[PDB]
């Protein structure tokens, strides 16, 4: 027949999977004027995107929510955003001093205010002091009568965070650089892995508020009007149960103690702060959930927990194991840290709740062992309403307990749709044509 | 090289015979001497505030050069200076008459006349001509 | 307070379409390939260093500045058992670049040194008359 010759094409719409660098592209309003928002790092890239979207309608791309790289690039960056911000603030090495702590006039908690001699920046004469110290940060030392010492002296350094900054979790949109198209599944029956039907293409991902909480997920993002629950093997016992429920469950948590301002001794140009006085009467902080909807919720969960084996033996159980930082429910609220007891939330089922919250001050970094941030609060009481669009469970009559040791799994619940592919725009094909040759 | 920024469009094409006043030639006679290797005769001696800024300066010299070659490269107008196309001008873009655009007008005012409409013209060259002619050329090689 | 539907095309919009429908779409994937705390800068060079390579390979093949072009290199039916009209009317590109992935290195050597190297020694020596 005819002779065929190769023919070069450019801009051919193909891709392979690649692992490249994405970049922050945040909000850009009210970042100026004292907003040292540590998530924004003063509005990281000021884009405020217009997230357009192109449907492709003939494309099947075999996704995977479990071998995704985008969740790995967050957990690199978030502690990396801490580390530059943890640097210039005040170091707290010279404070690990033996104490004399007595009972405070209006349980185990704030009973002990303390006193110790220190000579930080004057470097001439020591001076005793008065502070306010909770539990969960002190140790009654040996061979002495009522003498305390901070729990994390002989770890790495105990640098605090500065009061200019704010940990306010504004939504961050991950955009893609040139030559990379972030894709997104358009099927809401997407169970986590496998193929999709009519994958689209966005410039930039949707709202991701990088909140930090164990055992739940607060200001999250929720699917349509079925409850979807995904996991890795979903038969294996030591995996993580990602729960996406179709409605929100409203939460109130408050700190009724009128904590105030304060003046503690100065480092070298470094004023250090330790929580000033309460107004004179102590009410212990608590979360406060509308317990009807929560009771309504968990029977709705075993509707969709069930349909992978039989029609029998569903229960709910509370957590277990170790010190209360991994036991009790952890989350932040506006420059303040909460460890709340959540044993009441996990009664079993069949086919207004007040929770005792606990607050500490010396708080470990989230995954590294070693350094640890620190922040005394601002004046007044604290209130933050919130939401719930998910929780983290484990397998163990088939026992479900609230597990959790990685908020990447929270970010896996946020990024269960996305995939970044590089363009290989050059391509060739044969036809009958031929270059003119003389 | 901006010597005729107050001249008119019907007259600035006269002096544009010089290579846009040797536009790109000023870059190569710069980067021959921007690439004075005294930077390598020091290894900058450190990382300094200027070398951070020079690094962010050379990138924009790289990128914004490419965005002007690529758009000339895709338009079937690679490397030329005055090329015609096959796209018909639509009077909805500008209802100015002929001589007013050329004889009686600056350049930068004419930018603000069609800075709205500019992006539509970009697509209406490629998908109308340079995407299009390549298929019709390849049909004329099928025989 | 804005919004209208699609007019021309989207980015990667033809990537589920056939070849005969995607061949009129190449410019949108051609424009946005280049434009789009050090770790932005390390991206801003890789995006350049990938663009030059694809630009360079078109340059060697006598096919720089054109979006499409033809050569005189013969297609070898050992590379594809696919029929002709199945390719231009049924197969998408994303599938197509899994099928000729192995042969790609043979192709690129058999463009330059085959023809466009040879179309210069033949070209230079068509003088003297």
């Amino acid at each position, epitope marked *: 027949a005819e002779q065929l010759w190769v023919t070069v094409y450019y801009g051919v719409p193909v891709w392979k999977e690649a692992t490249t660098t994405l970049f922050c592209a945040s909000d850009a*309003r009210a970042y100026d004027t004292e907003v040292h928002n540590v998530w924004a790092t003063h509005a990281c890239v000021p884009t*405020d995107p*217009n997230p*357009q*979207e*192109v449907v492709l309608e003939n494309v099947t791309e075999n996704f995977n929510m479990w071998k995704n790289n985008m969740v790995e690039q967050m957990h690199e960056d978030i502690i990396s955003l801490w580390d530059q911000s943890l640097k210039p603030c005040v170091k707290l090495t010279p404070l690990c001093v033996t104490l004399n702590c007595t009972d405070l006039r209006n349980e185990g908690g704030e009973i002990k205010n303390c006193s110790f001699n220190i000579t930080t920046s004057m470097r001439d004469k020591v001076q005793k002091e008065y502070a306010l110290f909770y539990k969960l940060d002190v140790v009654p030392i040996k061979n002495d009568n009522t003498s305390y010492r901070l729990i994390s002296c002989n770890t790495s350094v105990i640098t605090q965070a500065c009061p200019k900054v704010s940990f306010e979790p504004i939504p961050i949109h991950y955009c893609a650089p040139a030559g990379f198209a972030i894709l997104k599944c358009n099927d809401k029956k997407f169970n986590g892995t496998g193929p999709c039907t009519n994958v689209s293409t966005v*410039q930039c991902t949707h709202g991701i508020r990088p909140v930090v909480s164990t055992q739940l997920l607060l200001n999250g993002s929720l699917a349509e009007e079925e409850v979807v629950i995904r996991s890795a093997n979903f038969t294996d016992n030591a995996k993580i149960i990602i729960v996406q429920l179709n409605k929100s469950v409203e939460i109130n948590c408050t700190r009724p103690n009128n904590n105030t301002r304060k003046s503690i001794h100065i480092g070298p140009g470094r004023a250090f702060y330790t929580t000033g006085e309460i107004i004179g009467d102590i009410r212990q902080a608590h979360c406060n959930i509308s317990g009807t909807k929560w009771n309504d919720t968990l029977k709705q969960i075993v509707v969709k927990l069930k349909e992978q084996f039989g029609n029998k033996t569903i229960v709910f159980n509370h957590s277990s194991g170790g010190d209360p930082e991994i036991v009790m429910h952890s989350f932040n609220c506006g420059g303040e840290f909460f460890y709340c007891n959540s044993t009441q939330l996990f009664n079993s089922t069949w086919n207004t709740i007040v929770l005792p919250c606990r607050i500490k001050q010396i708080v470990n970094m989230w995954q590294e062992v070693g350094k640890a941030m620190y922040a005394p609060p601002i004046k007044g009481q604290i209130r933050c309403s919130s939401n719930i669009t998910g929780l983290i469970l484990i397998r163990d009559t088939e026992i479900f307990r609230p597990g959790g040791g990685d908020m990447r799994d929270n970010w896996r619940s946020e990024l269960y749709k996305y995939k970044v592919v590089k363009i290989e725009p050059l391509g060739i094909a044969p036809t009958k044509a031929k270059r003119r040759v003389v | 090289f901006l010597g005729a920024a107050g001249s008119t469009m019907g007259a600035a094409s006269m002096t544009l015979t010089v290579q846009a006043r040797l536009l790109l030639s000023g870059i190569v006679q710069q980067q021959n001497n921007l690439l004075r290797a005294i930077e390598a005769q020091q290894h900058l001696l450190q990382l300094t505030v200027w070398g951070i800024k020079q690094l962010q300066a050379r990138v924009l010299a790289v990128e914004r050069y490419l965005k002007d070659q690529q758009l000339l490269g895709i338009w079937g107008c690679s490397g030329k200076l005055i090329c015609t196309t096959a796209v018909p001008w639509n009077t909805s873009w500008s209802n100015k008459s002929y001589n007013q655009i050329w004889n009686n007008m600056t350049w930068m005012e004419w930018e603000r006349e069609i800075d*709205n*409409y500019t*992006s*539509l013209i*970009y*697509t209406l060259i490629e998908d109308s001509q340079n995407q299009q002619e390549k298929n019709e050329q390849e049909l004329l090689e099928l025989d | *307070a*804005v*919004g*209208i*539907g*699609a*007019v*021309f*095309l*989207g*980015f990667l*919009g033809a990537a589920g379409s056939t070849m005969g429908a995607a061949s009129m779409t190449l410019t*949108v994937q051609a*424009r*946005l390939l280049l434009s789009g705390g050090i770790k932005q800068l390390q991206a801003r060079v890789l995006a350049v260093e990938r663009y030059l390579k694809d630009q360079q390979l078109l340059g060697i093949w006598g096919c720089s500045g054109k979006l499409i072009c033809t050569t005189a290199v013969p297609w070898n039916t050992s590379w594809s058992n696919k029929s002709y009209n199945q390719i231009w009317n049924n197969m998408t590109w994303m599938e197509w670049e899994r099928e000729i992935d192995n042969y790609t290195s043979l192709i690129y050597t058999l463009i330059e040194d085959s023809q466009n190297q040879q179309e210069k020694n033949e070209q230079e020596l068509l003088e003297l008359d």
Partner: antibody, heavy 134, light 109 residues
């Protein structure tokens, strides 16, 4: 400038009229328009909107599909035609101009889709009134 | 979206400052860099007239004592030394997206 309407009055259910707002002096093809409905003793309800080139039309959900709007940039007119009339449509209609100027449509590069910008109003016509009853 | 306001009735006399706020459910900040909330006034029996277009700027024929401010959700219009002819209603009008709604219109006597 001068901004009034015409064709108002009173009709029955199931009927169909068309008003006529006429502008005076500004370049009419440059600007988009609107329609608003103040019920007697109530607040205001937005009705409709046209682009400047008469290409983009956005209706309220309640009057969706029933009404009709159009432009004539040469005759500098503005029409609100209506169909399938109900008694609760009895209110004051007002013709109204956008405050700002609008541009041509935008055509974002990344997806071949134009964009018509829409902002609010400054010049309300005094407007006619249509009553639907027996 | 939903956007109501408060208080409905402020039957006052001239000589004092006060303010009228309009409360937003959806936050307003368009990607142009501005918050499309338009405050204006009708008189009884009249088609309305523009008081201020943006929450920052004003309109022609407007006394200087008409000041407005607000966040993306909080929105406030303040009238210093409330003038004798401040009768009728005061509608808060937003321009985020469609259908763009109103407030009830605060009556001031």
């Amino acid at each position: 400038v001068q901004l009034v309407e015409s064709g108002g009055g009173v009709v029955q259910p199931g009927k169909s009229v068309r008003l006529s707002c006429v502008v005076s002096d500004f370049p009419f093809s440059k600007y988009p328009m609107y329609w608003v409905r103040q019920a007697p003793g109530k607040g205001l309800e937005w009705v409709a909107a046209i682009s400047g080139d008469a290409w983009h039309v956005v209706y309220s959900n309640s009057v969706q599909g029933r009404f009709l709007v159009s432009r004539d940039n040469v005759k500098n007119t503005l029409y609100l035609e209506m169909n399938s009339l109900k008694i609760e449509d009895t209110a004051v209609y007002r013709c109204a101009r956008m405050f700002q100027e609008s541009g041509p449509p935008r055509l974002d590069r990344w997806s071949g889709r134009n964009y018509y910008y829409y902002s609010g109003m400054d010049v309300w016509g005094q407007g006619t009134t249509v009553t639907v009853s027996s | 979206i939903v956007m109501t306001q408060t208080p409905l009735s402020l039957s006052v006399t001239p000589g004092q400052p006060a303010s009228i706020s309009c409360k937003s459910s959806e936050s307003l900040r368009q990607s142009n860099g501005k918050t499309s909330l338009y405050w204006y006034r009708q008189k009884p029996g009249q088609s309305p007239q523009l008081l201020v277009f943006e929450v920052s700027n004003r309109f022609s024929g407007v006394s200087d004592r008409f000041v407005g401010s607000g966040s993306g959700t909080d929105f406030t219009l303040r009238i210093s030394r409330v003038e004798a002819e401040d009768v009728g209603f005061y509608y808060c009008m937003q321009s985020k997206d469609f259908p763009l709604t109103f407030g009830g219109g605060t009556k001031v006597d």
